[PDB]
Symmetry: D2
Subunit: 420 residues, 4 copies
């Protein structure tokens, strides 16, 4: 029997009763009367799972089809780590199939690479690329740079004033003061040379710094706030218009990420014997190079691409990112890649391949990497959490694995297009 709303408020308020005594229908009555907020259903109710169940029932009534959420799962999931960290207004979870592609022979080691995707043939094709690399002695990679960025926009009264601030940041003394404020916000914060650009009285400042094993967006944002506050002391007429003025650039296509790099800049390479190209990849070295020149270079050129000189790097990046608790929206910039191919060896029949990815935004701590299922996929690769002995080594290793797996995916798709 559904009790009145006045009586239900007294039971929940009591210390030795709680929501346990109230029913499903009674809690739904309190939320609709604005006594209890729907987004705090986890804290008020005895368990996290029951809070999600109540929000699903509230949502179902609003929908045109009441049984819409029937096959959206929610039970037996660890909501404790998601609440107040990863998601709000939670109505369940979305299971994404995870396949394995390996072994990927990279830097004299072997990796079993997890790939969360619903695209048919993606895992198996990437697996074929790994097999070709394995029979060809393996791949080698190098991290060329490491530093997450934030690109605020500030505004001085005049262009003459903004020019003065740019010159001030360029002196050794001015940069030293701003570096002191930036680095004071975190243990891993080490500010590199600034990258500034004027647009009239506007000034776009590109802060860059390592962030341990974190992706580092929040850490670099906090350091940027303290740095601009210190700059405000020397220039009180400056106005911080936005902590992100799209000069970072985060989650949008931008030539600045392609040229300067953002996060981890990485390069991989391998040599596939002529026999391996024929038997595994069902093509030739000559055919692979001709498709790479006219698709990945000339084709992308005709399309007006900036940073998209590859076949499907975004497929591999997105799959690994979802599996390993990364920010999947950062696939925009993280998938930037140029794939090159040429002839090699004594008879000029072997296929040299390289992929260069200047802006892989990645981390093994914080965000979705705090969740246990996501940590399982990181644990496969041996990069879960922060490396204490060498800060940033786990995040750098994951970036190398992404670049190497992208190269495996490039080998297989380009071989499929060449053979027809």
């Amino acid at each position: 029997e559904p009790r009145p709303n006045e009586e239900c408020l007294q039971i929940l308020g009591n210390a030795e009763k709680g929501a346990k005594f109230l029913s499903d229908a009674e809690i739904i009555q309190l939320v609709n009367a604005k006594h209890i907020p729907a987004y705090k259903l986890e804290t008020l109710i005895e368990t996290h799972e029951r809070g999600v169940s109540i929000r699903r029932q509230l949502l179902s009534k609003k929908l045109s089809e009441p049984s819409s959420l029937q096959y959206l799962p929610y039970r037996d999931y660890n909501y404790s780590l998601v609440m107040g960290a990863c998601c709000e207004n939670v109505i369940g979870y979305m299971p994404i199939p995870v396949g394995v592609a390996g072994p990927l022979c990279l830097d004299e080691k072997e990796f079993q690479v997890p790939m969360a995707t619903t695209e048919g043939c993606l895992v198996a094709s990437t697996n074929r690329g790994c097999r070709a690399i394995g029979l060809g002695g393996g791949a080698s990679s190098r991290v060329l740079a490491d530093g997450m960025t934030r690109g605020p926009v500030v505004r001085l009264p005049r262009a003459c004033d903004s020019a003065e601030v740019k010159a001030w940041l360029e002196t050794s003394e001015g940069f030293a003061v701003i570096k002191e404020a930036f680095d004071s916000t975190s243990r891993f914060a080490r500010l590199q040379k600034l990258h500034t650009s004027i647009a009239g009285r506007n000034l776009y400042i590109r802060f860059q710094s390592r962030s341990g094993d974190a992706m580092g967006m929040n850490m670099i944002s906090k350091g940027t706030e303290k740095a601009l506050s210190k700059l405000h002391e020397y220039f009180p007429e400056m106005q911080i218009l936005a902590v992100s003025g799209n000069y970072c650039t985060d989650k949008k296509p931008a030539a600045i990420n392609w040229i300067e790099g953002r996060g981890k800049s990485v390069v991989c390479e391998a040599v596939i014997p002529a026999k391996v190209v024929r038997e595994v990849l069902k093509t030739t070295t000559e055919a692979m190079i001709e498709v790479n020149i006219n698709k990945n270079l000339v084709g992308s050129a005709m399309a007006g691409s900036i940073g998209g000189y590859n076949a499907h790097a975004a497929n591999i990046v997105t799959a690994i990112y979802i599996a390993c608790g990364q920010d999947a929206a950062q696939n925009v910039g993280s998938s930037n890649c140029i794939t090159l191919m040429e002839a090699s060896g004594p008879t000029n029949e072997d296929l040299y391949i390289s992929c260069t990815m200047p802006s892989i935004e990645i981390g093994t701590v914080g965000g979705g990497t705090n969740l246990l299922p996501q940590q399982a996929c990181l644990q496969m690769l041996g990069v879960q959490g922060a490396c204490k002995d060498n800060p940033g080594e786990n995040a750098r290793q994951l970036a190398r694995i992404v670049c190497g797996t992208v190269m495996a995916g490039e080998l297989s798709l380009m071989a499929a297009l060449a053979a027809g």
Copy 2:
């Protein structure tokens, strides 16, 4: 208990044990699909440096029937992505509860705040401006003089009619629009474009493209199909051609937020919002050398909806293309007009990950699951409008947070 290799083969699955099946694989089929995943996980665990790595990677009680031979291979489980709800989104005199699969804290709550501002301001209106998935093969003739001849042939009415007949014959939803061609010496990049009903249409347009190129091969036997995709589509890479010509659904959305609502809900002013939009989304993206990235975080919303609704999440590269504009509005010039224009939303409600039941639950929330029989492509066009509208909600909230500081 473990039997020899000879005794295990004569019996062979249900009779044998889990330990015996592992011995058969290493020596150099399964009853249920769930059991097949379990055997793959045990073999994988021995190869890893930490054998208990897959402990918290779930796999049991998941419907693998629709995944095997369709969506994923070498399957070792599934990855649960938390789904949240942001709504109601008042769009075209309707109300939508938008599912958002993400692990970024505050994304769903912030998008929900943007929805609240739109709802208190009378709502949003959107229009689909274009619709047509593309494929951009590269072919090659002996000379540039020959590739020019093929370009001119495709430009004639009768030449285009022959290629359109071959293309449209592959599917009942296939309707070939005007071709866009581009020469690079003896190379010729042909951009086929066509509606695909409610499907995203990559497989449908690829099939029509192969038949179209085969027909072109009859008139020009010296032509060589180098690649069915020559990166002129362009699929899953940044490209100005998608920005200018469009790819999939081109969409526009708009709303007017009362000055009262900008102050109380968004904690800012209309003047501050316009100033940040001009200097971040236009001038800022311009200084960064952006093509199509004239927005705050469209990619966050696109990606979250895409994962929840069984889309190709890798297509967020081009689908996130967006320009966000803001100006003063109303009789006192204090209200905030906002528009978002997304020329290349690549989306669908049939095929791929939308065949799975959990993904279909999120599509069913929006009322766009499956193929619309009475009006082909209506559900896919509706989902594209919902994405553009939710992106606009996300733009309002994030831009308000940046302006306020």
Copy 3:
């Protein structure tokens, strides 16, 4: 005098002296050259060094065709050295290409590239498209309204009305399919049309003004914000010109025998291909280039443009070029080269092509003025010559870079 100078001017200016007219301070003065002299004297007193104008020439130049047409506030002319590179063997013909430049070695290097092409059987070119553009921005009250205008222009009926207004302005005004693009309540409309032998910026601007007035009849709430909303795009870098084309889209090609690559170009075919891939494709890609997949197309375009009375500011878009190179022939030692230039903005009538010195350089190439029997043939031929000469320039410079 002071008062007497005004009375004589009422009747003429020939009776008054140079110092008298300056005391007071085009149509007032009798001759055109005399008007330039008085303007130079007034300017000299304003300069910190009045002797600056000493070596800027002005006498004995035909100012009749420049006044009220090509330049204002004229104080003389700037002599640009003109050299000749050729013969350029193009489409079974031979061309002597004039090149106005002050860059040392440019003409001689381009001349070497021509020599390589000529010993290898010659080049062949094709015009792929033709149509100058104008890209206005209009504005409707809402995005729902701008979408209504876009759909209306896309129908056969709505396009027919706008095409009729556009085509009524000029003989050569023939409107091709429109290319529109929405940005909220804004609508950017790309009008395109051939323009005979003229570059066609004034002709397409007149057709666009009439087209937007006719569009306002059907949509009275529409506001023409600007006749150019940078969607053309004219004289700025833009991916739309690269993809859709602007003016003449052209391609050239040639096979250079292996012997010619060694003796004339002092390099090999293999060396040339490796530099082309890693400089013009990969190098330009790393630099974030849109349409700049070449060595120095801009050098050749600019030089020919100044010599032949073109708008040299249009080298921004006209120099768009992708240069490709691969192995060729039975032994795979011959060098196949092609250049593709999708947006050569060019003309042989109007503007600086009305001046006699500029017409001399056009007459060398056989493309001066309008082709009567085949309208647009002279402008198309000049675009083919530009693309062919660019290819000559690519061959020589790329060979110099490969050899080190």
Copy 4:
């Protein structure tokens, strides 16, 4: 020997240095050229007599058959940094000089413009190649150390007095390494000076990495005379900014428009319009018109208008009543000089002398080139003001 022989004697012998005199050498080359043209009378109105060919031969042009007169107009005074400039503009486009002159008048009545040079450094961007990507990565890291950069900086700076190497920018593409050398070049544009420093620098780098192959001294990473995002973001040559405030009264009477109309056209044309067109660095009306006209008049490399005209034009409301028009133009890659190339010729030096920037500034190296870059940016702003007013007024 050559002086005694007639014009007709040398021409019939065939069917540079031997002629001795310059003008007669151009005359003989015109006659040989005439017999190859379908219309030999084409050269009639192409002038050549009475021109100083002494500075052109072996410096600026080859196979010379005359000169091309380009009309030069004057737009001014341009009130810039408490000074006044009469800006020469070589063009054949009707109304360009007069429109630019109107923009100068609007700036003059509004108190004048102010400019600042933000950066200075011509670049060359060679491509080198190591055997593997691991090797090219090693060279990148070596150049990034303080000791490695010091050795390369020593070889670069030894080639010239003005050669002072700045921080290198490198980019890997597999086994390729693209290295962007940058340095001031006094008052010269500096393409020749930076190329010589780059050659000696790569030779020193080869001592430490002998398997390195210099594929090309320019690998299109400079980037010279092609559109490139690297020039827009990092700058090339002179990076400059200008600004001015135009009173509401001046916008109405001189420019025939309003401040509100000018800002709306600038937002929707120069920002949103250029954005829709897929532009990188083309956020302006016609900076290229002004850059090209000044460049041809002042002996610059006109082909460098590709990168030099990169410009973003911004406009907003200003003043107490918010009715005045603030304008700014930012041009990050003005490639320019007042010594070398076409600036060696006397007519071109006349136009440089009008602006007071001809030749090399002895007391302050690079001051004349910097001043001319400020004048270009300021004149571009005048051109932006006038054309934008014409479009706004319809």
